[PDB]
Ligand binder design. Structure first.
Ligand SMILES: NC(=O)C1=CN([C@@H]2O[C@H](COP(=O)(O)OP(=O)(O)OC[C@H]3O[C@@H](n4cnc5c(N)ncnc54)[C@H](OP(=O)(O)O)[C@@H]3O)[C@@H](O)[C@H]2O)C=CC1
Ligand SMILES: CCCCCCCCCCCC(=O)OC[C@H](COP(=O)(O)OCC[N+](C)(C)C)OC(=O)CCCCCCCCCCC
Ligand SMILES: [Zn+2]
Lengths: 181, 368, 115, 124, 112, 240
């Protein structure tokens, strides 16, 4: 927890000897820093005089000379395709089912039903004449419950916290602090 | 101005150079001409520099006041307007201004004499030196601006020196020198209108009796643009003046009604809008301020010129020879005296004086 | 949120007869504010010349027949009216609006370069 | 003579003068490209009327400096490798064939490489 | 289609009475074997006979007064390009793309 | 009392050859893709009269509607308990001159209730009207003004529609594809007129079109299919 820290543990120029004793007596908060960076510590090796020998970092699976076929990591050309669902295809999915739960007849009898949804088929007409259990199981969820808008992050919860934890303003200030929970 | 000033995209100078214009005639366009505008920081100079530089013509502006030249560069694109620190008593500075120029326009002239220059030095000495230096630099065209009453035998120092200036320029530069005689010019911050707009005009009974033929300053600068780019105007003299004759007393009273100084009957007399003084007193006051005041005041010579009216040389050429119709002062009078209106400030209703309104106001002034 | 002064609610008029009335109503509003336009922007022309200019601009679209084009033209005219009355335009823009000005022969264009 | 100051030539027919401001470069009189505008013509502009020509930027001509570098002669090898003599701070590494009986310059640095067996032929 | 949409576009009148646009399909470059650029229809404007390009004397820059010199519209079909050009009331003309004649090509023909 | 340690001199860890997983970033959206497909289908089922079609890309759901259906769909997506999209974060447009209706009008809605986002797509021409969602979302007032200023789309019912970005009296709509990037005019100070004036555009250096250097080869293939198995039309069983 980011509690108070003594002044000598902060990388700022401070007072010495008698002038340090005087500062502690007169300052309301003696542990605060003056904000002047330490001349002997801050930026003492300048970026142009660093002794570090830099090397380009490379990962093994994607930056090696072996077992590194590019198409195995070519995510840009394996982008998701853009698919739009109109009322004709939704009616087909509702009437014939999906490939996950097929409800379409077999053989030539099944291809007749598929060719129905190759032209305009209104969804309202499909809903008008259809078994209601299909709507309660495919279009709706949990036996007819409405489909709630899906969350962008299911782990976005919060919990109310008190001053002893978050260290912010006490309860008499008109703001509150929510943690991750 | 228009959109393209030149009559053709290829022009051959009097010295043999072939100049080709590029572009449609905007800021980024060029005309192939380089011009030197002596006295380009003056009243007429800024109009001339603005018209030349706005179409791409390179302008060289000799100057002596460093702060006054700054506003000239806005007229042209990068590299169009150039400045040279010069003095008419420095021959090298003048020769540098005309070295690369195809046209030299001499707008240098004065009505007063100072501790450093006399009327002769500026009106005659400066013009002669510029004209002679231009010829030795092989400048194709020279344009000199004299006064409206230029006469070498005139009893006024200003008119006589202007008259001699015309002759000394033609002798040095040669017969290919064009001379312009503009009338008093009206425009924003125009010296001809500034005197009339001054509330405390001392000796208005003696000074404001002069009769002139005022001409628009924008047209004078436009005429110079026509003359510089038309070699058919070489060796000619142009008298630029308006059709309607005006007396300064008529203009003074017409302005007084436009400014609405007369909204309070007592105010014009109390504020000093009329300062009748004897001419011998005005001569004494003008003589004294010629050596006490550090700023150019109404001097002795201008007192003489109040008794001399503007006479037009019939033999000289006019706007008709340049294919222009002179602007009427009644049309542009309101827009140039508008800044001096007392209150206005859209309180109840602005009184906009049109061409017909000004002419009617002239009748009211002369109506007793 | 309150709309600004002289703000109208955009509407698509489906009747040609109704559209004519709206244009006439807006035409009179321009004429009534002509003196206000002169005072606010400090023009060099009298209010009579402003009304002539307003009439000329309105007459340029007199023979427009397509109703969908009329709605856009009327809507933009209302926006222009609101801009002028509320003094949102700077005085330079209005001065240039009234600063709008026999064509050259074939040879005259030829000698100078033409387009 | 204004002919050596305005025409591109492989060599200057005279010795360049470092104090002459009409030369293309302080170390070279003539321009080194057919489309390179001569310095004398460029300085003859209205914008140089009251400007001191000595203080204008006049970098040395690189064409004269590169040919002061001696030819690198390679022993027991017909291929020369050059990367700018700087490595990571030079130019991309390229390989130059030296079979022909002449010096062949680098495509980036302009350093000329040749075989030692052709040293007598090249120098004469 | 018949609506004169140029009355409300706000573009200057010079686009109609003085400029000519070309509806074309880009030809295959002779230096490359790709044909991707030839799959779309494009619209550009003919250059101004004067003032299309001129040399700025200060730096040698390519000055211009044609505001449409760098505008190239992209269309997926020829009909879409025509419909847009007609809608804006532009003076245009169509350059029909050249089609390559098909000739059989086999390795056996190198000897027969 | 102790001196502060020198952070430069502190020892640092030693790492060998690093390893990293290689997987398609689209794989992490598998739950989001399927849930949005079900929610998108639920909206079409609730509004068959208005919803033309819907699409799902990773974690973004788009609803496509006609201009005459914009008000109803937005009202449904705002007041329905399962879809409480109270906030309209953005209203924008895009120009497609090829199509009969040039402009796609896009509405991005946010539901702080369920931590969800949805998109509404409609279409417009240069003269066709689009209903204003200002009565529904007061935050769309400025967005619709910006759309009109840069495109010219007719928003019917807007309480105060006018320019919001361009200069007063500006001619043209910049974001249209036929509008030149540099415009038609430019400004300067006229010494004679003592004011700033508009003049026809002239460029000292014309804009250089380096876009003609685009590759003559297609760069991305047909992509990979990420449609959920529960949303593919079934293949009938083979012959007996
Ligand atoms: N109503 C009018 O103004 C009339 C004008 N003229 C003449 O037209 C010409 C243009 O003058 P205008 O613009 O109208 O008003 P100005 O008198 O203010 O113009 C005078 C110009 O000449 C320069 N000048 C005067 N003396 C010198 C000098 N010793 N050395 C260098 N420059 C000098 C001035 O430069 P700087 O400003 O730096 O001092 C200034 O640019 C003048 O010659 C004038 O005599 C004649 C009749 C009517
Ligand atoms: C305090 C004293 C002020 C006297 C000014 C003066 O005498 O100034 C006037 C003269 C003339 O020169 P000018 O002012 O440029 O003339 C232009 C203005 N006229 C034509 C109206 C005169 O100047 C001098 O003799 C300068 C003397 C400087 C003395 C030291 C100060
Ligand atoms: Zn090399």
């Amino acid at each position: 927890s980011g509690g108070p820290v003594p002044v000598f543990k902060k990388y700022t120029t401070g007072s010495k000897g008698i002038w340090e004793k005087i500062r502690q007596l007169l300052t309301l908060v003696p542990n605060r820093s003056t904000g002047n960076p330490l001349v002997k510590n801050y930026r003492v090796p300048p970026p142009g005089s660093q002794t570090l020998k830099y090397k380009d970092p490379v990962t093994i699976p994607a930056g090696d000379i072996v077992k590194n076929q590019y198409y195995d990591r070519d995510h840009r050309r394996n982008y998701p395709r853009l698919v739009a669902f109109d009322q004709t295809k939704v009616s087909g999915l509702l009437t014939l089912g999906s490939a996950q739960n097929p409800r379409i007849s077999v053989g030539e009898k099944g291809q007749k039903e598929l060719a129905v949804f190759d032209q305009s088929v209104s969804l309202s007409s499909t809903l008008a004449t259809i078994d209601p259990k299909v709507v309660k199981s495919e279009l709706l969820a949990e036996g007819g419950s409405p489909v709630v808008a899906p969350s962008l992050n299911k782990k976005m919860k919060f919990r109310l916290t008190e001053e002893s934890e978050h260290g912010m303003y006490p309860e008499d200030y008109p703001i509150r602090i929510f943690a991750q929970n | 101005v228009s959109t393209f000033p030149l009559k053709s995209d290829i022009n051959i100078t009097k010295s043999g150079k072939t100049l080709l214009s590029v572009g449609q005639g905007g800021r980024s366009s060029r005309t192939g001409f380089t011009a030197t505008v002596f006295g380009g920081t003056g009243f007429l100079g800024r109009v001339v520099v603005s018209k030349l530089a706005k179409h791409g013509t390179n302008v060289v502006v000799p100057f002596r006041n460093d702060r006054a030249r700054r506003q000239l560069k806005v007229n042209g694109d990068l590299g169009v307007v150039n400045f040279v620190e010069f003095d008419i008593r420095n021959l090298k500075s003048i020769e540098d201004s005309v070295k690369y120029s195809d046209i030299v326009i001499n707008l240098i002239g004065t009505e007063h004499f100072s501790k450093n220059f006399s009327i002769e030095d500026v009106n005659i000495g400066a013009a002669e030196r510029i004209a002679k230096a231009a010829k030795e630099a092989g400048v194709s065209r020279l344009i000199h601006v004299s006064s409206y009453n230029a006469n070498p035998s005139s009893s006024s120092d200003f008119y006589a020196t202007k008259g001699i200036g015309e002759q000394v320029v033609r002798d040095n530069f040669g017969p290919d020198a064009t001379i312009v005689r503009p009338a008093p010019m009206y425009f924003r911050n125009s010296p001809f209108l500034n005197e009339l707009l001054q509330i405390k005009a001392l000796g208005g009974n003696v000074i404001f009796k002069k009769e002139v033929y005022p001409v628009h300053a924008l047209q004078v600068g436009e005429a110079i643009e026509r003359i510089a780019f038309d070699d058919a105007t070489a060796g000619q003299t142009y008298e630029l003046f308006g059709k309607e004759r005006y007396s300064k007393k008529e203009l003074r009273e017409m302005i007084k009604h436009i400014i609405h100084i007369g909204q309070r009957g007592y105010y014009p007399y109390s504020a000093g809008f009329y300062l009748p003084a004897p001419e011998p007193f005005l001569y004494a006051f003008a003589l004294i301020r010629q050596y006490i005041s550090s700023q150019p005041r109404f001097n002795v010579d201008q007192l003489k010129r109040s008794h001399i009216n503007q006479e037009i040389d019939q033999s000289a050429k006019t706007f008709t020879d340049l294919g222009m119709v002179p602007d009427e002062l009644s049309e542009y009078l309101y827009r140039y005296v508008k800044p001096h209106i007392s209150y206005t400030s859209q309180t109840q209703n602005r009184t906009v004086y049109s061409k017909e309104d000004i002419e009617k106001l002239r009748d009211y002034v002369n109506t007793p | 949120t309150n709309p600004t002064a002289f703000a109208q609610t955009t509407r698509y008029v489906k009747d040609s007869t109704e559209m004519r009335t709206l244009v006439l109503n807006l035409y009179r509003r321009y004429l009534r504010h002509s003196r206000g336009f002169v005072n606010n922007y400090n023009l060099d022309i009298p209010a009579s010349q402003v009304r002539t200019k307003i009439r000329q601009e309105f007459e340029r679209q007199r023979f427009v027949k397509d109703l969908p084009l009329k709605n856009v033209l009327y809507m933009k005219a209302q926006m222009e009216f609101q801009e002028l009355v509320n003094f949102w335009k700077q005085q330079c823009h209005v001065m240039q609006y009234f600063e709008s000005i026999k064509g050259d022969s074939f040879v005259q264009k030829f000698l100078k370069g033409a387009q | 003579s204004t002919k050596e100051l305005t025409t591109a030539r492989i060599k200057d027919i005279s010795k360049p003068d470092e104090n002459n401001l009409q030369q293309q470069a302080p170390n070279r009189i003539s321009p080194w490209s057919k489309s390179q505008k001569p310095r004398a013509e460029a300085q003859d502009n209205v914008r140089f009327a009251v400007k001191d020509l000595a203080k204008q930027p006049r970098p040395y001509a690189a064409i004269d400096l590169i040919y002061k570098q001696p030819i690198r002669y390679i022993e027991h090898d017909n291929v020369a490798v050059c990367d700018g003599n700087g490595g990571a701070q030079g130019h991309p590494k390229v390989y130059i064939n030296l079979d022909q009986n002449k010096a062949i310059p680098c495509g980036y640095c302009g350093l000329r490489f040749a075989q030692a067996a052709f040293k007598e032929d090249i120098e004469s | 289609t018949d609506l004169a949409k140029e009355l409300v576009s706000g573009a200057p009148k010079e686009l109609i009475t003085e400029r000519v646009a070309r509806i074309y399909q880009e030809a295959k470059a002779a230096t490359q074997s790709g044909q991707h650029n030839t799959e779309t229809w494009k619209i550009d404007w003919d250059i101004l006979n004067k003032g299309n390009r001129w040399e700025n004397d200060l730096m040698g820059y390519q000055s211009s007064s044609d505001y449409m010199q760098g505008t190239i519209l992209k269309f997926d079909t020829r009909e879409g390009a025509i419909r847009f050009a007609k809608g804006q009331g532009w003076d245009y003309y169509i350059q029909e793309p050249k089609v390559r004649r098909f000739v059989k090509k086999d390795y056996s023909a190198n000897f027969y | 009392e102790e001196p502060l340690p020198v952070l430069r001199d502190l020892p640092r860890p030693e790492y060998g050859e690093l390893h990293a997983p290689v997987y398609n970033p689209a794989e992490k959206y598998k739950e989001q893709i399927e849930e949005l497909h079900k929610f998108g289908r639920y909206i079409m089922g609730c509004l068959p009269k208005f919803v033309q079609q819907f699409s799902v890309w990773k974690d973004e759901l788009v609803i496509y509607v006609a201009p005459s259906a914009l008000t109803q769909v937005a009202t449904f997506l705002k007041d329905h308990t399962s879809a409480q999209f109270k906030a309209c974060m953005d209203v924008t447009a895009a120009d497609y001159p090829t199509r009969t209706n040039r402009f796609d009008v896009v509405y991005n809605l946010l539901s702080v209730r369920h931590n969800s986002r949805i998109r509404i797509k409609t279409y417009a021409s240069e003269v066709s009207p689009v209903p204003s969602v200002v009565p529904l979302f007061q935050g769309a007032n400025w967005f619709e003004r910006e759309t009109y200023d840069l495109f010219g789309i007719f928003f019917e019912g807007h309480p105060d529609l006018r320019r919001i970005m361009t200069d007063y009296g500006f001619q043209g709509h910049p974001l249209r594809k036929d509008f030149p990037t540099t415009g038609y005019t430019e400004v300067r100070y006229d010494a004679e007129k003592r004011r700033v004036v508009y003049e026809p555009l002239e460029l000292t250096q014309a804009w250089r079109n380096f876009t003609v250097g685009s590759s003559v080869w297609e760069q991305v293939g047909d992509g990979k299919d990420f449609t959920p198995e529960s949303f593919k039309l079934p293949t009938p069983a083979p012959d007996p």
